[PDB]
Structure 1
Amino acid sequence: NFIPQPQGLLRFLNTSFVSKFYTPQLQLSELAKKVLTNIKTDDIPVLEREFNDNTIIHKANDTLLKVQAPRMYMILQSIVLEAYAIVNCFVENPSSLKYLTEEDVSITRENLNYVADYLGNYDDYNSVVLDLRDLDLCFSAIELQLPLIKKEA
């Protein structure tokens, strides 16, 4: 019982300069690890249409960050997997929400700030930063609300 994923998102998800305020650690959550293995092994259903011209469609792939800064591109994939992981359990199959914890989202926001600040240097690719800032405050709400949800449920 899983909604078929877009082809673009499926392709995207399946695989010096430093900021002074926030820095990354390249750490993956336990919940994120399980979802990666499931997609890697199981052949999840996928869609055939690509009407939705938003998110990674022609923004994450169109930008030259993929070829210029592959290390930065790894950070964006990690945020997407963490973003997809939390959206997965709440919409359907909430049993996997047990593995999530506060520190999983805390590191993700720090990674988002680091990549977001680097993208600010480029003037052409501010469209990607437009969505990241909105997504940045979304994780913080989950960070300050996730412990209450598990105890309530």
Structure 2
Amino acid sequence: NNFIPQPQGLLRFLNTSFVSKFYTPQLQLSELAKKVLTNIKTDDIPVLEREFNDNTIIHKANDTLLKVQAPRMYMILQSIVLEAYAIVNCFVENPSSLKYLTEEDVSITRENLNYVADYLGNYDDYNSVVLDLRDLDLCFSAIELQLPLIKKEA
């Protein structure tokens, strides 16, 4: 937010009984999500006057009726994107946001990611989204192992 603007669709998407045999969630907002979300909700952020990259995962979620068919799981996806969006911001700019994220906060995102991934598997409309989220499920695990180590380095 401090350095560069962001797309209008992502800003609009982010401001806002099934069971798996392997997973259960808990809807904790990460401490970094808690303070970044307020900034997104407020107008103090630059934003762009045009949109491109229609292949992103955000437009995929928008195109499907997941909002009205399963608003619970639509909510969880917003939570996944909220944590995932914030941890991209700190490395590229504003390092002062560090020491506000813990491996437990990052860990439960995989819990929530797979708890929604099973649900998405029951309706093969959402295959395009399923394919995407599985790629991120291994991405976070790497960050969890390196986050305690990186924090001491920085």
SS at match of 2:83: helix
- How far is 1:125 from its partner? 1.4
Q: What is the distance in 2 between the residues matched to 1:90 and 1:58? A: 25
User: Could you say which residue in structure 2 is the equivalent of 1:144?
Assistant: 145
User: Could you say which residue in structure 1 is the equivalent of 2:95?
Assistant: 94
Q: What is the distance in 1 between the residues matched to 2:34 and 2:58? A: 24
Q: What is the distance in 2 between the residues matched to 1:95 and 1:57? A: 28
1:52-96 deviation digits (Å, cap 9, x = unpaired): 112244301011111111010110000000000100100100110
- How far is 1:22 from its partner? 0.9
Gap change, CA 1:110 and 1:57, over 3 Å in 2: closer
Q: Is the 1:13–1:81 Cα contact (8 Å) retained in structure 2?
A: yes
Gap change, CA 1:76 and 1:113, over 3 Å in 2: same
Identity %: 100
Gap change, CA 1:51 and 1:42, over 3 Å in 2: closer
Q: Is the 1:4–1:46 Cα contact (8 Å) retained in structure 2?
A: yes
- How far is 1:111 from its partner? 0.1
Q: What is the distance in 1 between the residues matched to 2:44 and 2:29? A: 22
Extract unaligned runs of 5+ from structure 2: none
Gap change, CA 1:151 and 1:57, over 3 Å in 2: closer
1:71-110 matches, within 5 Å, as 71-110=72-111
Q: Is the 1:13–1:77 Cα contact (8 Å) retained in structure 2?
A: yes
> TM-score when scaled to structure 2?
0.95
Q: What is the distance in 2 between the residues matched to 1:126 and 1:49? A: 27
**Count of paired positions:** 153
Moved over 6 A (4+): none
1:79-138 deviation digits (Å, cap 9, x = unpaired): 000000100100100110110011010111100001011101111210001110001111
Q: Is the 1:79–1:108 Cα contact (8 Å) retained in structure 2?
A: yes
Extract unaligned runs of 5+ from structure 1: none
- How far is 1:24 from its partner? 0.8
SS at match of 2:60: coil
Q: Is the 2:57–2:132 Cα contact (8 Å) retained in structure 1?
A: no
Q: What is the distance in 1 between the residues matched to 2:23 and 2:30? A: 19
